[PDB]
Amino acid sequence: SMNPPPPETSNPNKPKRQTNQLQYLLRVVLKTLWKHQFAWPFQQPVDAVKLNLPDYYKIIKTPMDMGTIKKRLENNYYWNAQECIQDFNTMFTNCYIYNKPGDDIVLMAEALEKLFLQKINELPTEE
Numbered sequence: 001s002m003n004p005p006p007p008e009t010s011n012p013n014k015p016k017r018q019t020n021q022l023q024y025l026l027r028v029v030l031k032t033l034w035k036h037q038f039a040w041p042f043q044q045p046v047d048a049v050k051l052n053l054p055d056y057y058k059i060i061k062t063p064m065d066m067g068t069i070k071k072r073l074e075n076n077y078y079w080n081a082q083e084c085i086q087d088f089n090t091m092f093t094n095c096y097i098y099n100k101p102g103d104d105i106v107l108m109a110e111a112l113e114k115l116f117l118q119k120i121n122e123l124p125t126e127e
């Protein structure tokens, strides 16, 4: 069983930009979520081999995690805030799709998502 290559975190062909909103996503949003008690399952790509979930990448064709998000923000990979928001929403959705409602990981994701939403409710207007 093999993992797919992880999502890219830089690309010379993709335009890059810093915006005040992306900075807020790194400094406030990601910072807050990263150190939460439930962040650890989401801090890196799902290692389907070592975790023994060999159907994970049969079901999840759009893998995303906060390690990837963090590196993309750090690298200025994103053009806008909406690209970054999308990656968080992809991560959460992947968890809900693969796992069964109720399950512990799902409750962890929900708590993380609640906090995410609270933080992006205060995204600044772009300068």
Ligand SMILES: Cc1cccnc1-n1nc(-c2ccccc2)nc1-c1c[nH]c(=O)c(Cl)c1
Pocket: 040, 041, 042, 046, 051, 094, 095, 098, 099, 105
């Ligand atoms: C929470 C869980 C339950 C059952 C199987 N694997 C997991 N793990 N374990 C980890 C882990 C372990 C050590 C260091 C970093 C992450 N990550 C998961 C995991 C399982 N299923 C998922 O949908 C995600 Cl997003 C993470």
